[PDB]
């Protein structure tokens, strides 16, 4: 599955960071079966923390590390699964992953963004 | 192919008679479970009293001494999707003159849906003493004889005309 994300995303501290993610799946998005997991790891060999998941509807896990700054910013039926991180902080630097399953499409999609926080 | 025909309105005394009540379905392929009642009021009264109920495949008859016996189901056989509810009287008496009713209750079956439906058919029966030939038949036969005769006469006339003229022209040459 083709998943389009910026490999590196550079955002100023305090600004809003939209993490763009779209995916080219031919099959129509069935909200009763579509699956999205947005995870976060500090390093390639570090632990992933799921922070948002589309299971039937948008589930925001409200991880303490993000406070209430995570928002969904996509539209699954339009093949957009982007998220928004409001008022970015230096600790938000790291790796963010968009996982995508669009049954009955066989292949799972994976986008990986390296978010860097500028002064 | 179900075809809704309608019954006759005159029965001959002392004989047997088959009342019609045919209630087709809109789409033949659907499944149904039909059961039917009949009601009748003898001419000279205003009260439709039940007489028979045909359910499953067994006919149930009320105790109306007008129809104690003398009646037999003659609709559809062993189908549970009746689509034809005609009954058959035997030994027609004079008490069988009145208005008959044929209630059809049909439960249609669909994917996730069941729609009970109802249809009522009304019939008016008059018992006579001798079978009267229908006016249409007599009129048609009379018109047939008349047409045959008038065409024959036209031809004969034309022939005699052309024949006398042809004999004249024959003798001229």
């Amino acid at each position: 599955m083709e998943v389009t994300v910026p490999a590196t995303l550079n955002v100023l501290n305090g600004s809003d960071a939209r993490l763009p993610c779209t995916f080219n799946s031919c099959y129509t998005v069935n909200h009763k079966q579509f699956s999205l997991n947005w995870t976060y790891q500090e390093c390639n060999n570090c632990s992933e923390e799921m922070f948002l998941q589309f299971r039937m509807k948008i589930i925001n896990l409200k991880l303490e590390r993000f406070q209430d700054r995570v928002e969904f910013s996509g539209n699954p039926s339009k093949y957009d699964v982007s998220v928004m991180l409001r008022n970015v902080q230096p600790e938000d630097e790291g790796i963010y992953n968009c996982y995508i399953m669009n049954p009955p499409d066989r292949h799972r999609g994976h986008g990986k963004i390296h978010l860097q926080v500028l002064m | 192919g179900c075809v809704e025909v309608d019954s006759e309105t005159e029965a001959v005394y002392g004989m047997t008679f088959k009342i019609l009540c045919i209630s087709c379905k809109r789409r033949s392929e659907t499944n149904a479970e039909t059961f039917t009642e009949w009601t009748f009021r003898q001419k000279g009264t205003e009260e439709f009293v039940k007489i028979l109920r045909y359910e499953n495949e067994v006919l149930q008859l009320e105790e109306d001494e007008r129809f104690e016996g003398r009646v037999v189901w003659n609709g559809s056989r062993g189908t549970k999707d009746l689509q034809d509810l005609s009954i058959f009287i035997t030994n027609v008496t004079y008490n069988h003159s009145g208005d008959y009713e044929c209630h059809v209750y049909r439960l249609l079956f669909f994917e996730n849906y069941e729609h009970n439906t109802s249809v009522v058919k009304k019939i008016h029966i008059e018992v006579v003493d001798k079978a009267n030939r229908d006016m249409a038949s007599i009129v048609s036969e009379i018109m047939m004889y008349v047409l045959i005769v008038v065409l024959t006469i036209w031809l004969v006339a034309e022939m005699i005309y052309c024949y006398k003229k042809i004999a004249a022209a024959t003798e001229t040459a």
Partner: protein, 1418 residues
């Protein structure tokens, strides 16, 4: 100059330079026969061995001045070049350039490239090649780079005129080389690999003869411009009609009434998206993927109770079948034009909108589909015939030029074994032995045919011994001839090779314990009847056709093939992966469908299917998996190009063969036909035996009657009598339309008809009696029509007598009653139109029967092969609930199927009900395959076949598709060619017999036809006089300017584009905008009308086009007013749309300017009468078949094709179904439910409430005869005849450049005659002929030298070297007028008017002619 060969030298190069320079300072077409690429003229003789393949100086004088040099091969092939330094680097003498030119024109080099192309093509077809193949790809591109280089190193890049880039064909491989090196360094990877397929195209520029063929195809296309414009125009007009009538109709669905949770339609339609969801609210009919349609009218489809019709959701077929926008309507109408699965659109539309609209489809199919397709055929045939007449003219005239140049060269030159071999060779008697072996082989075949599926062991072994004795006789006759001839002698006739191969295969299959599919060759042995000489002319016709297909027109076949290959590989490259991936869209089990493009073979199958006329269904799936656009583009290209090449090949074969047999000459066989010799021998023998047996038997042993006859003869020929009889016929026939399944409801009419039948019978019996009395038996019973009427009245009288007597219902009498359907036949002898068409059809029946017989033998071969391959292999163990073939993992063979029946319930081991179990069903299945209707199901069962009683597996064979492809190619392509061909060659002999007159028009219609052809004249009338009132004169000089008409045309086009922009549920704002724009356009054109009507005061009604414009103005205004009036006062949607239909008239004015479309439409108008007569006959036949259907198939089960609507129950439904299958669409669907006749398929004890008939099974024999006969009659009439009609009217129309006119200037001929014939003897000397022709004025003037033309006119000569005056007069008038038909008509009058004035015949005897006399002199 046979010895003009000179090595291109430096000194000669300098010479050429200085020569061209001097000529230019001081300051013709090249000889096309010396043009490069051709062959060297033999007049130059052999080439010196030191001169071949070397730079030589230019031979053609036209290039002798220009800077060039020619090189020739060892095959006398001319190769021009440019002597300028290639890339200003190499001289024509440089060693590099020298060897470059050496190798470029070398035989090995040319062949090398062909083999490379072919092997690369083979490599292209692997969907997922292994890795190492990259090295081979590098090899390919390296070879291509090398060959391109060696060519640039010879001809240069662009530095000259004869240079690489000059030939367009080099551009292809050039951009291929470019891609070859862009694609590896710089990087949609599935769209780049396809581009390398142009290497496949490269074969066209190497195989000798393909450039010519593609040029011929291009020239054929360039003439199809106006037809394509007209096609677009008609499709657009009909598409606007459909958009007006059906917009948003196909969205109707049966929505359930009772909803829970207080929900509405909207709250639901946005919350569910899945098949299993939409199945909970709308009604889907058991196994369909779309919801059932419905309608608000009374003649539309119904919804069950608890379901209401409502307009919501998507259209059917994923959304690709609709009249919503203009593009979808255009697609649907293009689909209607080619008749691809049209019947499905037909049924869907009629269900939604009601049966009446049938009229729309009727007109589109006849006026649109049939007419435009035949127009295409006619134009392609005309272009081909023109170019091929030109080509045969060039070939023959250049052969005569070769004879002339050859003549010019000629004038310039001026023991016991041997005697035993000869004792056996005695029995090689052609009229005996050959006949004998031909007879046995026919028997053998018949014996093989007796093969069928369920066989007793006896029959099997009997057949086996038979194939033993036949093998023995064949081998025995083989070796005898083998020794009486010996190899050199034996192996020269093709048929000896045939029989040798046959006996070899026979014996090798004799010994072999194992069984092989060589049975096919066994069956082929039947071809031996081809060895029966021309005596059977049509079999020779077929074999000659096939020969031309692989012979003369071989290059075309090869081109079709390449094209199919290219399209298959490009489809495989573009769409394969998509089919594999997004598969779960077009299938419910995420498995590839039966037709896909994932590998080369299936892709080729899809391309082949498209060419066979089915393109829409695969396209839908492709559009679903790939994008709409790309898919459309690919299939539209395939459709148009492939069908064009198919039509070209078809017409080439047809025309070539038949017009050549028209042109061929004496072909008496070298050997008297053995048959013929023998038949004379056997006829002489049987006559001798007749005579000997006759001899043996003889030696062993008053006025009133004539008055009556005259009178009744005066009766039956009066006009009143015939009119009354025709009225009775119409009434009696119409009375049959009322006996349907609902006659029981309408009792009165039932009795009325029952009684009127007797009146009709009485009238017709009286008529027959009068016929007898007036004509007598000898005059009567020798007529066909009277015989027909007699038979009909006989069956009616028998039905009557039996009935009245009282034993009615006595079996066969009830069946005989159904023959009442023949009563309409009494109308054929009354209407002159039907009479002429029927006459023509009867006149053609012989030839039809011969070609039919030829086809039956050829199809017999394929039927026997199919019986060998597929006998009894179509059984399958299915789940009757949902019709699923069990998986075959369980239930592997028939035994297990029965076990499951024991255990389970709804399983059933059923056959296919049309199969190859024997030769009859073989013939039926082959007909279904040859008409492409019904084939799919037969083929799938075939490719899944495993063995006799084993469960079929999904594509276990997969290659019997080859069998069906071959059978199509032969039995459906070639046989249709031969069929169409003989019926058009015969329709020309009928035409010739009656003096070249239309054989489909009666007298009144011939008169109307001539008067209407007199409309395509060019008589220019005076333009309207300019009025004097300047206030009108300005308007006049304005309205007649050409700019005015141009502006009006662009206004009409804008109006069209405005009508196009409408669509389903557009808006309110857009609706109002469009309304006001329409108002403005109405005002504008009204304005033009008024202005015309103030300038052309009373001349505006002298043009029919202006009358049409006036009419459309009136209609448009009335339509607008009445539409708004209805919209206010009342409410009626259907009526509102029907009345808005009127605004289309403003569009029809576009044809006024297109000077090419008017011609084609004039041709259609010319052809209207013949089409009317044919339509009458077709309607009569349709009527008869309807009545039988209603009689027979009124109660059959509802399986497929027979549904709630579209049944044979009433007259309307029967006529609808018959009109459908008139185009043979879906006739298998109608036939299928008739073929079942035993439980559990049907029930012979069905009840049918409201009727006394029992059972729902039809009679298979009756149904088969019914449908086969009907589609054959339709093919005989509506196709062939229609085509013939149009193929002649089109010719007639496109002849418009006609009228030849001149006046009697003959007095000047006589004024000159007196000065040379002073005594007025009407004769002059031959010597004086040379100056008399030089003293006349034009056009009879003959300038010096008159002698060469005067002798070619072969004037007759009287004794004394004298010529008559009428001879030279007729000779000169012929020279100006030509060889016209009136030229011989006038001469008959000119010679007769002289014979009446000069009875002295003695002085006119011609002794010689001028052409003979000059041959006596020389």
């Amino acid at each position: 100059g046979p010895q003009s060969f000179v090595h291109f030298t430096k000194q000669s190069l300098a010479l050429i330079e200085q020569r061209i320079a001097e000529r230019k300072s001081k300051e013709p077409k090249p000889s096309s026969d010396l043009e490069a690429g051709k062959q060297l003229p033999f007049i130059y003789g052999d080439i010196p061995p030191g001169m071949v393949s070397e730079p030589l100086e230019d031979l053609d004088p036209y290039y002798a001045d220009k800077k060039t040099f020619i090189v020739l091969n060892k095959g006398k092939t001319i190769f021009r070049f440019n002597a300028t330094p290639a890339l200003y680097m190499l001289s024509p003498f440089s060693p590099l350039r020298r060897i470059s030119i050496k190798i470029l024109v070398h035989s090995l080099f040319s062949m090398l490239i062909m083999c490379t192309i072919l092997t690369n093509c083979i490599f292209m077809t692997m969907n997922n090649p292994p890795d190492w193949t990259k090295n081979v790809e590098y090899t390919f591109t390296g070879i291509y780079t090398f060959e391109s280089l060696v060519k640039i190193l010879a001809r240069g890049f662009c530095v000259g005129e004869f240079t690489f880039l000059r030939d367009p064909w080099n551009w292809l491989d050039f951009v291929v080389i470019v891609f070859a090196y862009l694609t590896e360094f710089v990087n949609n990877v599935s769209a780049l690999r396809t581009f390398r397929v142009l290497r496949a195209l490269k074969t066209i520029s190497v195989i000798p003869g393909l450039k010519t063929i593609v040029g011929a195809l291009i020239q054929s296309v360039k003439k199809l411009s106006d037809v394509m414009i007209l096609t677009v125009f008609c499709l657009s007009v009909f598409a606007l009609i459909g958009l007006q009538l059906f917009m948003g109709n196909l969205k109707h669905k049966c929505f359930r009434n009772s909803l829970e949770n207080n929900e509405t339609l909207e709250s639901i339609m946005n919350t569910l998206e899945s098949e299993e969801d939409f199945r909970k609210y709308f009604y889907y009919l058991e196994g369909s993927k779309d919801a059932l349609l419905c309608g608000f009218s009374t003649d539309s489809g119904q919804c069950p109770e608890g379901y209401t019709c409502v307009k919501i959701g998507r259209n059917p077929d994923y959304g690709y079948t609709s009249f919503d926008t203009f593009s979808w309507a255009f697609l649907a109408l293009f689909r209607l034009m080619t008749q691809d699965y049209w019947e499905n659109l037909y049924q869907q539309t009629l269900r939604a909108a009601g049966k009446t609209y049938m009229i729309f489809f009727v007109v589109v199919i006849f006026l649109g589909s049939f007419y435009l397709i035949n127009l295409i055929l006619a134009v392609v045939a005309m272009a081909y015939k023109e170019q091929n007449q030109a080509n045969i003219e060039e070939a023959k005239q250049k052969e005569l030029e070769f004879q002339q140049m050859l003549d010019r060269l000629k004038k310039e030159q001026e023991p016991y074994w041997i005697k035993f071999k000869k004792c056996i060779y005695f029995i090689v008697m052609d009229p005996f032995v050959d006949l004998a072996i031909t007879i046995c082989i026919v028997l053998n075949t018949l014996f093989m045919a007796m093969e069928h599926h369920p066989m007793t062991e006896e029959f099997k072994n009997v057949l086996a011994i038979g194939n033993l004795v036949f093998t023995g006789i064949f081998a025995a006759e083989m070796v005898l001839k083998l020794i009486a001839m010996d190899p050199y002698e034996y192996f020269q006739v093709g048929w000896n090779i045939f029989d040798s191969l046959i006996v070899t295969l026979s014996l090798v299959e004799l010994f072999l314990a194992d069984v092989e599919g060589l049975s096919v060759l066994r069956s082929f042995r039947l071809l031996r009847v081809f060895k029966l000489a021309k005596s059977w002319p049509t079999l020779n016709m077929l074999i000659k056709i096939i020969g031309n297909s692989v012979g003369a027109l071989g290059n075309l076949t090869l081109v079709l093939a390449i094209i199919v290959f290219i399209f298959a590989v490009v489809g495989m490259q573009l769409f394969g992966k998509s089919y594999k991936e997004c598969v779960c869209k077009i299938n419910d089990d995420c498995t590839l469908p039966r037709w896909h493009m994932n590998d080369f073979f299936h892709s080729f199958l899809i391309v082949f299917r498209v060419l066979c006329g089915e393109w829409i269904e695969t396209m839908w799936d492709c559009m679903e998996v790939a994008g709409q656009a790309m898919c459309l583009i690919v299939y539209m290209m395939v459709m148009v190009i492939g069908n064009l090449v198919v039509l070209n090949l078809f017409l080439a074969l047809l025309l070539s063969s038949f017009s050549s047999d028209n042109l061929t000459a004496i072909e008496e066989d070298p050997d008297a036909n053995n048959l013929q010799i023998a038949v004379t021998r056997i006829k002489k023998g049987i006559n001798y035996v007749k005579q000997t047996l006759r001899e043996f038997i003889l030696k062993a042993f008053g006025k009133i009657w004539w008055n009556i006859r005259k009178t009744c003869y005066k009766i039956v020929e009066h006009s009143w009598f015939e009119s009354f009889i025709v009225l009775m016929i119409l009434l009696s026939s119409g009375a049959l339309a009322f006996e349907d399944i609902y006659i029981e409801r309408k009792k009165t009419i039932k009795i009325i008809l029952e009684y009127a039948d007797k009146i009709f019978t009485y009238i017709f019996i009286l008529e027959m009696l009068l016929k007898w009395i007036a004509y007598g038996y000898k005059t009567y019973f020798t007529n066909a029509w009277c015989w027909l009427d007699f038979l009909i009245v006989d069956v009616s009288l028998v039905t009557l007598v039996a009935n009245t007597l009282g034993y009615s219902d006595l079996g066969p009498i009830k069946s005989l009653r159904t023959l009442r359907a023949l009563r309409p036949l009494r109308a054929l002898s009354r209407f002159e139109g039907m009479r002429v068409v029927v006459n023509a059809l009867i006149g053609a029946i012989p030839s039809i029967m011969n070609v039919l017989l030829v086809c039956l033998i050829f199809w017999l071969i394929f039927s026997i092969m199919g019986v060998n391959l597929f006998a009894g292999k179509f059984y399958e163990c299915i789940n009757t609930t949902d019709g699923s073939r069990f998986p075959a993992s369980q239930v592997p063979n028939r035994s297990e199927c029965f076990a499951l029946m024991n255990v389970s319930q709804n399983v059933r081991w059923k056959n296919l009900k049309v199969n190859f179990d024997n030769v009859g069903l073989g013939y039926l299945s082959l007909l279904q395959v040859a008409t492409f209707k019904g084939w799919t199901i037969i083929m799938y069962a075939a490719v899944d076949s495993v063995n006799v009683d084993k469960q079929p597996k999904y594509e276990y064979s997969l290659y019997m598709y080859i069998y069906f492809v071959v059978f199509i190619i032969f039995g459906s392509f070639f046989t249709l060619n031969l069929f169409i061909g003989v019926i058009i060659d015969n329709f020309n002999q009928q035409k010739k017999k009656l003096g070249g007159q239309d054989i489909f028009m009666t007298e009144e219609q011939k008169k109307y036809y001539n008067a209407m052809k007199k409309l395509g004249s060019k008589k220019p009338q005076k333009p309207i006089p300019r009025p004097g009132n300047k206030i009108q004169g300005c308007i006049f000089d304005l309205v007649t300017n050409q700019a005015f008409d141009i502006s009006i045309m662009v206004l009409i086009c804008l109006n069209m584009v405005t009508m196009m922009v409408e669509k389903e549920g557009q808006s309110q704002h857009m609706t109002e905008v469009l309304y006001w724009i329409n108002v403005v356009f109405i005002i504008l054109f009204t304005g033009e009308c008024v202005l015309k009507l103030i300038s052309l005061r009373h001349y505006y009604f002298t043009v029919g086009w202006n009358i049409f414009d006036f009419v459309v103005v009136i209609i448009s205004i009335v339509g607008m007013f009445l539409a708004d009036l209805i919209e206010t006062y009342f409410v009626s949607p259907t009526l509102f749309r029907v009345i808005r239909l009127a605004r289309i008239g403003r569009i029809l004015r576009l044809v006024k300017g297109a000077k090419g479309i008017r011609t084609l439409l004039f041709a259609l108008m010319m052809s209207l009468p013949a089409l009317f007569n044919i339509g009458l006959l077709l309607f009569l036949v349709m009527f008869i078949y309807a009545i039988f259907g209603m009689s027979n198939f009124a109660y059959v089960k509802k399986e497929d094709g027979i549904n709630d609507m579209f049944n044979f129950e009433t007259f309307g439904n029967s006529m609808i179904c018959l009109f459908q299958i008139t185009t043979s669409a879906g006739w298998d669907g109608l036939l299928a439910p008739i073929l079942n006749s035993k439980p559990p398929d049907c029930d012979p004890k069905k009840v049918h409430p409201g009727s006394s008939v029992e059972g729902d099974c039809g009679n298979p024999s009756v149904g088969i005869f019914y449908f086969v006969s009907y589609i054959i009659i339709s093919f005989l009439v509506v196709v062939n005849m229609y085509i013939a009609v149009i193929l002649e009217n089109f010719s007639v129309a496109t002849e418009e450049s006609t009228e030849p006119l001149s006046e009697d200037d003959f007095e000047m001929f006589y004024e000159v005659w007196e000065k040379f014939d002073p005594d007025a003897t009407q004769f002059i000397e031959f010597s004086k002929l040379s100056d008399f022709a030089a003293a006349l004025d034009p056009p009879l003037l003959i300038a010096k030298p008159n002698k060469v033309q005067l002798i070619a006119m072969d004037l007759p000569m009287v004794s004394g070297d004298r010529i008559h005056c009428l001879d030279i007069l007729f000779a000169f008038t012929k020279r100006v007028l030509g060889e016209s038909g009136e030229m011989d008509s006038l001469r008959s009058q000119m010679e007769e008017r002289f014979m009446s004035a000069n009875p002295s015949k003695v002085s006119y005897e011609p002794i010689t002619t001028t052409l003979k006399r000059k041959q006596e002199d020389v």
